[PDB]
Design a protein around this ligand. Structure first.
Ligand SMILES: CCCCCCCCCCCCCCCCCC(=O)OC[C@H](COP(=O)([O-])OCC(O)COP(=O)([O-])OC[C@@H](COC(=O)CCCCCCCCCCCCCCCCC)OC(=O)CCCCCCCCCCCCCCCCC)OC(=O)CCCCCCCCCCCCCCCCC
Ligand SMILES: CCCCCCCCCCCCCCCCCC(=O)OC[C@H](COP(=O)([O-])OCC(O)COP(=O)([O-])OC[C@@H](COC(=O)CCCCCCCCCCCCCCCCC)OC(=O)CCCCCCCCCCCCCCCCC)OC(=O)CCCCCCCCCCCCCCCCC
Ligand SMILES: CCCCCCCCCCCCCCCCCC(=O)OC[C@H](COP(=O)([O-])OCC(O)COP(=O)([O-])OC[C@@H](COC(=O)CCCCCCCCCCCCCCCCC)OC(=O)CCCCCCCCCCCCCCCCC)OC(=O)CCCCCCCCCCCCCCCCC
Ligand SMILES: CCCCCCCCCCCCCCCCCC(=O)OC[C@H](COP(=O)([O-])OCC[N+](C)(C)C)OC(=O)CCCCCCCCCCCCCCCCC
Ligand SMILES: CCCCCCCCCCCCCCCCCC(=O)OC[C@H](COP(=O)(O)OCCN)OC(=O)CCCCCCCCCCCCCCCCC
Ligand code: HEC
Ligand SMILES: [Zn+2]
Lengths: 64, 43, 89, 116, 144, 295, 114, 66, 84, 109
């Protein structure tokens, strides 16, 4: 009852606080560094395999 | 909204390469301190 | 004042007629690629004296029909009674 | 290692970029403008040879003439800089603080501001 | 913090370069100036008061080379450095002005932003020598 | 994670390569008022659709799971619906569950609370009457490719010839929207077949649109209840969005306020040993660790 | 990070080689009243009067506070309910059974007097 | 409370000696000793009396002229 | 106004977005027991939120308590509307 | 392994070192006593209570707390330079001494 109701909420403004702190320091630094590489590899490989399987299906269905 | 208390513009920029600590304004009318003059006179 | 005035044009939907044949024969140029592919498939299947029953011109025709009705169906519905949009959205 | 056409187009535009880049000294800008005219001279000759066109060689010598007249004007304008109280470095002709210059410092011609 | 006293220039320089302080205050003193007696007490008081700086005192008489290395002109001198770069310099004896300079430098540095990997400590002369090879070297190659 | 579009399997769902499926929804956009944003059913459209169903479609198909009084308050009034339903007759053999309630033993006029039964007594009778095929029940016809668009497309789309290699036997017709493109339904909707009560011109697309609207209206989870539920979804979304700031205040601001502590550590050298640290400690899982772990 | 391992032969809670902070380097407390951080609305004496009244007459009676919470829930429901229903009903005015019946009656009158 | 200017309260300029501050406080204390204004005077003099406290107060202000 | 509050909060000096102390800071409780010696040379606090997180409303605290009750009541009212 | 040395140096040693320095810690706090040992490990607690002085685990916990008090309140926290410098003052040789001595003591006793 002797403190801020919302302390430190938007110090530095939208740009500094939200962009820098939230995105770069939390989201990127704590999540994307860890999984961007394996997730990218898995997504690309899955897309390639699905495309090959669909091409085999297309060859099965269409003879011309 | 126009704030008349803010009188800064591109004309008043006072960033110099030599001074690592930027000066208060762009008027180079800073005088020496009393102790510096006395010490140099003693020298 | 509009609504209390006579209508200048009477479409054939408003005459209780089906324009679907005209719309089909007008949406065909939009899907010439699929139509040509279906013709080529039919020509290829005709030449083979013996063919697997799994082989048919059914799928090229399915694609061509899909394209033609993609062109055709919405514009016929858009003129019907009860297909008007809402007052705001 | 680069084709001459692309090389010379890029050279002309890079010369213009470097002319803009360098500090605004009138003599330096004059020299770079002469270099720009010479690059145009070379490009015109190259295309004249490629396309078997005789008008571009004319462009070469007309560039020579235009550049000569422009250089004469530039020499006279610099000597005019002498007589007026102006510096050949234009960045020293204003009080706008510039971080690119180590020693830019101007103050009012007063010995002191306050008397009492 | 607490004043670190030095009489040898090499030892003091090695200590400062090993510490690599973010904010440092160097007090160069000599015995020719009678006012240096009060400057010692002022330096001690400000050192115990302030904890963000590292306070190093150098006796110029016992370490003359230090003077030449630090461009000391008129003792007593208080040199305020940030990451080894000269923030400011004060000549003479006055405690209020010294505290004001310390406060100003502290707040300005606290309001600063440094890109990652470019906030390392550097030696003093490193700033002078960087501009020397940029200006003085070429001038000496034209006149001589 | 990416699927082809030219193999006939929409979005990776396989099994429907033998018919046209995406016309209503994916390839082309058929507008239905009840499926738009803040849209609802058209009462006149549903009314005309029920008229079409009663006059033509109900002579072969049925909606066993549903009764006539679904149309109350949205398409018909009680009295007019009563006469219109009474235009048809029902039998005790029609009833799926003829308990003691249905004490009749002959034909009688239908009532609005009766299930919508076909004129046939049984599915086998329907098959026998319709040349071996059964007119499908419309109770759950929503689970067809493009749903309401499926009904509309089947009603239309009798304007093509089979390709080479496809043979259409007698009693069957070519329809690209039906499975295997061979259907046992002759073309039903002809121009001017049904005389509308409201005077709307009666064309084949109009009747197909109306009957599709009616059949979709009778459905569950997609008819006569979806629009109000979407409005409820919008209201709940607005409530959550407006309550987000107060949740942030309470939780995050309270935590940040509680974590604003001051800590001080001092030197204690009064000659007292830390016997409580050396000879202290409790563990609730000691009953598990004892006798087994670290002996 | 600080030093070698310490075993139980030291017998003192703070070992002699742990440095202490002299009192000259300790931050002294501030013993004066700082200006309040308040907004324009809450600095109004009328708003303070309202807060005092609300506290003393509703907050100090827990069941009255529960009635206050019920009122807040009522306001929440009506705020989230009324506008969506209003716009939804205004959007579909022309798609009503009353409009359909009006058209049917007009057509019936025309056909009768035809 | 609200932000307060101690030099304005004591009626002295920033570059004033300590004895000037004492004299100003005594002159203002003879008048309002027997509420809010006297409290402001007391707070300003308490802050400005100590050299360290006055220096710390002056550093944060960064005064403007006039 | 909200614009004014944003304007004051825009000028705060921070270290990579966090309001933390720029120097080591030590505090001593003057009324601490005599067996407690001096502060050990360990930086126990990086921040100063105990002093920075203040509104200085010690002359009116029940008002802030009532405001916190009101915010809690609004949150509970939304939850209770859904439960109803 | 000798051909793979630069990758291991970049992605194992330097990765953990950078994360620890950002948190204001060193490889001490991640390699001397594990996280699962400082909390809910009756064997480690018994050995520490029977042989160790309180300040070891206490100082490690104090560093963790001084970081996470700010981190929990406002996430994405980088310690200032005066904490990172204190962290960087400690080298890996003393950490190796501590780790080896602790492991040998635990085994032997
Ligand atoms: C994920 C999302 C996270 C979102 C987080 C919050 C975003 C920022 C919100 C504004 C803010 O910083 O509030 C902190 C602020 C507290 O300020 P502080 O940090 O203590 O600063 C100290 C100052 O000295 C100020 O001290 P003070 O004594 O003035 O205390 C301020 C506090 C004191 O007043 C109260 O506590 C009022 C209690 C509730 C009253 C009824 C509110 C409805 O509030 C007011 O004075 C506000 C007066 C009424 C303004 C109404 C504006 C909307 C009108 C419609 O709290 C308020 O202003 C109360 C909330 C008012 C708005 C609530 C709804 C906002 C959003 C609505 C739309 C949502 C769309 C989605
Ligand atoms: C979904 C939307 C995602 C949007 C963001 C996508 C990524 C943006 C990246 C970017 O521009 O970052 C700058 C910026 C962060 O820059 P920073 O934090 O200053 O980091 C400086 C450097 O980027 C240095 O950053 P660092 O040191 O934190 O990261 C080192 C980086 C260095 O990059 C690599 O090592 C590349 C590895 C490629 C494969 C190597 C295979 C082995 C060698 C052959 O390596 C990795 O991140 C991968 C870790 C190892 C993977 C496995 C290697 C074997 O990105 C953001 O702030 C993203 C905000 C997103 C908000 C949502
Ligand atoms: C693409 C992302 C996909 C994944 C999204 C996800 O799962 O997010 C988790 C995330 C879980 O939250 P968290 O990670 O615990 O931290 C969120 C805190 O609010 C964090 O609070 P804070 O103290 O760190 O402040 C940061 C806050 C700062 O607040 C603001 O920027 C609000 C400003 C309000 C007006 C202020 C005016 C100026 C006032 C000045 C005076 C005071 O800005 C944000 O949080 C921006 C990102 C919001 C979450 C993502 C929103 C899109 C979700 C759907 C993606 C598809 O989910 C949400 O936040 C859900 C929000 C509601 C979503 C539906 C409505 C939109
Ligand atoms: C027993 C305790 C709970 C009693 C019930 C009411 C609690 C809320 C009202 C109340 O008393 O608030 C004031 C109390 C106390 O508030 P207070 O501490 O601010 O004090 C108010 C009273 N004065 C000011 C007088 C001191 O708040 C709580 O108890 C908070 C906890 C309850 C939070 C809300 C829970 C209900 C909503 C849940 C919905 C879940 C989804 C629906 C169900 C799905 C599964 C079936
Ligand atoms: C009165 C408020 C109206 C909604 C907000 C303003 C929207 C303006 C643009 C518009 O008309 O958006 C329509 C869009 C849904 O339209 P559409 O996507 O075509 O249909 C659903 C199938 N995806 O609408 C949307 O995507 C919004 C859906 C959520 C409801 C609005 C929430 C507003 C915030 C509370
Ligand atoms: C009796 C002659 C019928 C009338 C009148 C209507 N339909 Fe019909 N329909 C009939 C049969 C015998 C069949 C089955 C064909 C087969 O080969 O299985 C059908 C089928 C349909 C379907 C297909 C449903 C499916 O299971 O995929 C639809 C959508 C359909 N009928 C609609 C429909 C409508 C809207 C009618 C009123 C205009 C209608 N039918 C009349 C027999 C008869
Ligand atoms: Zn055409």
């Amino acid at each position: 009852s002797n403190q801020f109701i919302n302390f430190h909420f938007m110090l530095g403004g939208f740009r500094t606080y939200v962009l820098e702190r939230f995105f770069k320091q939390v989201w990127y630094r704590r999540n994307i560094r860890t999984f961007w590489f394996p997730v990218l590899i898995s997504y690309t490989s899955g897309c390639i395999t699905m495309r090959m399987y669909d091409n085999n299906c297309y060859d099965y269905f269409y003879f011309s | 909204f126009q704030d008349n208390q803010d009188r800064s513009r591109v004309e008043t920029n006072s960033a110099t390469w030599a001074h690592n600590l930027p000066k208060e304004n762009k008027f180079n009318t800073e005088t020496l301190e009393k102790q510096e003059v006395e010490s140099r006179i003693l020298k | 004042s509009s609504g209390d005035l006579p209508s200048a044009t009477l479409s054939m939907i408003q005459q209780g007629q089906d324009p679907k044949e005209l719309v089909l024969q007008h949406c065909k140029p939009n899907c010439l690629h699929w139509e040509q592919k279906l013709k080529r498939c039919e020509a290829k299947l005709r030449e083979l004296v013996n063919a697997d029953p799994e082989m048919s011109c059914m799928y090229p025709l399915r694609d061509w029909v899909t394209c033609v009705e993609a062109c055709v169906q919405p514009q016929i519905i858009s003129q019907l009674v009860g297909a008007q949009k809402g007052r705001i959205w | 290692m680069l084709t001459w056409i692309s090389f010379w187009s890029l050279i002309f535009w890079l010369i213009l970029i470097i002319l803009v880049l360098k500090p605004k000294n009138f003599i330096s800008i004059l020299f770079m403008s002469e270099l720009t005219w010479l690059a145009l001279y070379c490009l015109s000759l190259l295309f004249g040879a490629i396309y078997c066109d005789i008008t571009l060689l004319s462009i070469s010598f007309f560039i020579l003439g235009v550049a000569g007249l422009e250089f004469s004007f530039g020499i006279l304008i610099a000597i005019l800089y002498k007589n007026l109280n102006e510096s050949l470095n234009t960045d020293l002709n204003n009080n706008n603080n510039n971080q690119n210059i180590f020693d830019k410092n101007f103050k009012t011609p007063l010995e002191k501001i306050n008397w009492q | 913090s607490r004043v670190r006293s030095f009489n040898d220039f090499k030892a003091a320089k090695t200590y400062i370069d090993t510490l690599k302080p973010k904010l440092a205050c160097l007090y160069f003193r000599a015995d020719w100036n009678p006012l240096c007696e009060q400057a010692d007490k002022d330096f001690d008081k400000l050192s115990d008061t302030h904890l963000e700086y590292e306070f190093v005192k150098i006796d110029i008489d016992k370490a003359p080379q230090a003077k030449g290395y630090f461009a000391v002109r008129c003792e007593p001198e208080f040199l305020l450095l940030c990451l080894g770069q000269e923030m400011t310099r004060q000549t003479g004896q006055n405690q209020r002005n010294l505290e004001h300079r310390l406060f100003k430098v502290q707040e300005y540095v606290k309001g600063l932003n440094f890109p990652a990997g470019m906030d390392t400590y550097e030696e003093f002369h490193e700033q002078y020598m960087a501009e020397h090879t940029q200006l003085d070297k070429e001038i000496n190659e034209w006149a001589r | 994670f990416i699927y082809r579009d030219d193999i006939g399997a929409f979005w990776g769902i396989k099994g429907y390569e033998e018919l046209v499926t995406e016309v209503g929804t994916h390839k082309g956009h058929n507008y239905w008022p009840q499926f738009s944003f803040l849209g609802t059913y058209d009462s006149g459209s549903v009314r005309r659709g029920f008229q079409v169903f009663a006059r033509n479609c109900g002579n072969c198909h049925g909606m066993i799971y549903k009764k006539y009084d679904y149309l109350l308050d949205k398409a018909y009034r009680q009295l007019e619906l009563a006469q219109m339903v009474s235009d048809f007759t029902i039998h005790p053999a029609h009833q799926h569950f003829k308990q003691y309630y249905y004490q009749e033993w002959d034909e009688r006029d239908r009532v609005i609370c009766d299930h919508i039964y076909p004129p046939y007594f049984s599915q086998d009778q329907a098959k026998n009457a319709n040349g071996g095929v059964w007119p499908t029940d419309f109770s759950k016809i929503k689970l067809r490719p493009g749903g309401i668009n499926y009904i509309y497309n089947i009603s239309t789309g009798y304007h093509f010839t089979p390709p080479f290699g496809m043979d259409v036997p007698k009693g069957k017709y070519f329809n690209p929207y039906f499975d295997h493109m061979i259907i046992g339904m002759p073309r039903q909707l002809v121009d001017g077949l049904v005389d509308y009560d409201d005077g709307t011109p009666a064309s084949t697309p109009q009747m197909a649109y109306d009957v599709s609207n009616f059949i979709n209206f009778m459905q569950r989870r997609v008819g006569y209840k979806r629009p109000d539920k979407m409005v409820r979804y919008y209201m709940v979304f607005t409530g959550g969005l407006l309550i987000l700031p107060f949740k942030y205040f309470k939780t995050k601001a309270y935590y940040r306020n509680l974590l604003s502590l001051r800590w001080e550590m001092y030197a204690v050298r009064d000659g007292v040993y830390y016997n409580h640290f050396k000879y202290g400690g409790y563990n609730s899982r000691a009953y598990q660790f004892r006798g087994y772990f670290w002996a | 990070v600080y030093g070698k391992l310490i075993f139980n032969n030291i017998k003192e809670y703070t070992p002699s080689w742990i440095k202490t902070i002299p009192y000259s380097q300790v931050t002294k407390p501030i013993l004066r009243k700082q200006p309040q951080i308040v907004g324009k609305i809450n600095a109004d004496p009328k708003v303070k009067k309202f807060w005092v009244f609300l506290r003393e007459n509703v907050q100090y009676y827990p069941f009255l506070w529960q009635f206050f919470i019920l009122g807040t829930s009522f306001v929440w429901f009506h705020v989230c309910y009324d506008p969506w229903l209003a716009i939804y009903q205004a959007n579909n005015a022309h798609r009503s059974l009353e409009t359909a019946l009006t058209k049917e009656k007009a057509h019936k009158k025309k056909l009768a007097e035809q | 409370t609200q932000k307060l200017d101690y030099y304005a309260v004591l009626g002295v300029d920033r570059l004033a000696t300590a004895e000037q501050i004492k004299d100003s406080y005594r002159k203002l204390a003879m008048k309002y000793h027997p509420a809010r204004k006297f409290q402001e005077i007391a707070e300003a003099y308490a802050v400005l009396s100590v050299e360290e406290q006055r220096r710390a107060y002056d550093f944060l202000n960064q005064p403007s002229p006039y | 106004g909200v614009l004014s509050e944003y304007n004051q909060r825009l000028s705060k000096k921070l270290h990579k977005g966090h309001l933390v102390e720029d120097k080591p800071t030590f505090f001593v409780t003057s009324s601490r027991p005599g067996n407690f010696g001096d502060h050990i040379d360990f930086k126990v606090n990086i921040d100063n939120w105990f002093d920075e997180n203040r509104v200085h409303n010690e002359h009116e605290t029940d008002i802030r308590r009532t405001q916190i009750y009101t915010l809690n009541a609004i949150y509970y009212g939304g939850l209770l509307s859904f439960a109803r | 392994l000798r051909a793979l040395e630069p990758l291991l140096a970049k992605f194992i040693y330097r990765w953990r070192l950078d994360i620890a320095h950002q948190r204001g810690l060193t490889l001490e706090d991640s390699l001397l006593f594990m996280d699962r040992e400082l909390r809910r490990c009756y064997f480690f607690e018994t050995v520490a209570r029977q042989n160790l002085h309180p300040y070891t685990v206490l100082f490690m916990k104090k560093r963790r707390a001084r970081y996470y008090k700010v981190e929990r309140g406002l996430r994405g926290f980088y310690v200032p330079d005066w904490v990172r410098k204190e962290a960087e003052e400690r080298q890996l040789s003393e950490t190796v001494d501590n780790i080896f001595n602790w492991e040998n003591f635990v085994y032997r006793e």
